[PDB]
Design an enzyme around this catalytic site. Structure first.
Site, mmCIF file in Angstrom:
data_model
loop_
_atom_site.group_PDB
_atom_site.id
_atom_site.type_symbol
_atom_site.label_atom_id
_atom_site.label_comp_id
_atom_site.label_asym_id
_atom_site.label_seq_id
_atom_site.Cartn_x
_atom_site.Cartn_y
_atom_site.Cartn_z
ATOM 1 N N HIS A 1 0.807 -1.215 0.000
ATOM 2 C CA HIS A 1 0.000 0.000 0.000
ATOM 3 C C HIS A 1 0.843 1.268 0.000
ATOM 4 C CE1 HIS A 1 0.588 -0.585 4.430
ATOM 5 N NE2 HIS A 1 0.744 0.725 4.375
ATOM 6 N N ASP B 1 0.139 -7.725 1.823
ATOM 7 C CA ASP B 1 0.578 -6.335 1.789
ATOM 8 C C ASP B 1 2.098 -6.259 1.720
ATOM 9 O OD1 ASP B 1 0.035 -3.421 2.009
ATOM 10 O OD2 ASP B 1 1.035 -3.631 3.953
ATOM 11 N N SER C 1 5.158 1.985 7.693
ATOM 12 C CA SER C 1 4.825 0.913 6.763
ATOM 13 C C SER C 1 6.028 0.544 5.904
ATOM 14 C CB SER C 1 3.653 1.322 5.872
ATOM 15 O OG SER C 1 2.427 0.832 6.386
#
EC number: 3.4.21.-
Lengths: 12, 149, 249
Positions: free
Chosen positions: C42, C102, C196
């Site tokens: 993402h 992810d 992230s």
């Protein structure tokens, strides 16, 4: 809530 | 006469041979000069596998006897992220080198031992990789700084 | 990074900062091999409009850069290597809605110079078990919505997959086999926004090498009690990573 840990966070 | 003029008796060059091996040589005799395993025929500063000379009607040879030069592999192929060490820098037949990867940040894929020997065909040969060079892969997870408190 | 301490300079040479050409950081990464950066999927695409994800929704390689050997968040030192982006490949079975798989790979445009401050992190050769202490690093948000000046890190245990899948059952958020959870049950230490793609690494006590277990992905807020930070299980899609990168330990 359940959000992505990125910038910006993809919150929901 | 039956044989014709006799050419002077040939002396095979060092690290080489003459074929056919005759006791004497006469008119129309054709001979191929070659070298032993690991050497190449050198004539007029040119590398050859064989060299042919005939015995002329006047009793003289077509050319002088060439020499045998050692097969040279020259400089080995440069290895990316690697260095080259020696044990013999001869770089000629039977002489050997050793490939190493620039440690510690790079490591060699343990498929070969790094040693490359100059073959008779003038090619650096590894017993496993052959003429192919080894590969240097990055080393991971080894930090050069410890943790404190 | 919630409730962490500043990492010492040179103890995390594999961490990467995925930042805009502006310089503002937005995600983290980990150096793999010589020219690859693994990160969250993402991080590498914009929000879906056609709610389906397309290749045009991805982030253009000429729109962001990757910094290696970085210690400060906004300051710079001589160790920083600013590198462009060549290619971006997300997981084929990646789901942006459920954050399943992810994970993504970033092919660097220029390969970095491997030194004591820039070197890759190893890949996991097997699965991980409960209670294993892992180190999670990043420049993300802290408590009370703050940002650090240097790299922050936490040491949390890996939570059991059954108890984590049951921890998100109240929120009706599934946790698949490609996700791994960490953090204590009391809350506190956890990753947050901006972390992230950041590394969650541990030490192979036999080989003496650190290796990557997961990358920061998602979670319910940051550091909540009865909640665990969720990371992308690297061991699950290691073959896909190795099939695309080709690098090996």
């Amino acid at each position: 809530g359940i959000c992505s840990r990125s910038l910006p966070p993809i919150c929901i | 006469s039956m044989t014709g003029n006799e050419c002077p008796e040939l002396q095979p060059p060092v690290h080489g041979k003459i074929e056919p091996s005759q006791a004497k040589y006469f008119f129309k005799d054709q001979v191929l000069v070659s070298c032993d395993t690991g050497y190449k025929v050198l004539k007029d500063n040119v590398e050859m596998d064989t060299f042919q000379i005939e015995c002329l009607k006047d009793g003289t040879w077509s050319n002088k006897i060439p020499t045998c030069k050692i097969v040279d592999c020259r400089a080995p192929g440069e290895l990316e992220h690697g260095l080259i060490t020696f044990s013999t820098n001869l770089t000629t037949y039977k002489s050997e080198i050793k490939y190493s990867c620039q440690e510690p940040y790079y490591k060699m894929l343990n498929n070969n031992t790094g040693i490359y020997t100059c073959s008779a065909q003038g090619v650096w040969m590894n017993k496993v990789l052959g003429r192919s060079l080894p590969t240097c892969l990055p080393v991971c997870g080894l930090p050069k700084f410890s943790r404190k408190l | 990074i919630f409730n962490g301490r500043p990492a010492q300079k040179g103890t995390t040479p594999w961490i990467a900062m995925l930042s805009h050409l502006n310089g503002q950081p937005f995600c983290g990464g980990s150096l793999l091999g010589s020219s690859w950066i693994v990160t969250a999927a993402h991080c590498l695409h914009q929000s879906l409009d056609d709610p389906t994800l397309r290749d045009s929704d991805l982030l253009s390689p000429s729109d962001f850069k990757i910094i290696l050997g970085k210690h400060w968040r906004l300051r710079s030192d001589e160790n920083e290597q600013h590198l462009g982006v060549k290619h971006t490949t997300l997981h084929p079975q990646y789901d942006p809605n459920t954050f399943e798989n992810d994970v993504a790979l970033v092919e660097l445009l220029e390969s970095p110079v491997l030194n004591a401050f820039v070197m890759p992190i190893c890949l996991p050769e097997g699965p991980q078990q409960e209670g294993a202490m892992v180190i999670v690093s990043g420049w993300g948000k802290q408590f009370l919505q703050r940002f650090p000046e240097t790299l922050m890190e936490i040491e949390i245990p890996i939570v059991d997959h059954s108890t984590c899948q049951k921890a998100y059952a109240p929120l009706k958020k599934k946790v698949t086999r490609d996700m791994i959870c960490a953090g204590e049950k009391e809350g506190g230490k956890d990753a947050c926004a901006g972390d992230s793609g950041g590394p969650m690494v541990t030490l192979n006590r036999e080989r003496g090498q650190w290796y990557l277990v997961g990358t920061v992905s998602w979670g319910d807020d940051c550091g909540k009690k009865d909640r665990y930070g969720v990371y992308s299980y690297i061991h699950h899609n290691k073959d896909w990573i190795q099939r695309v990168t080709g690098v090996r330990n």
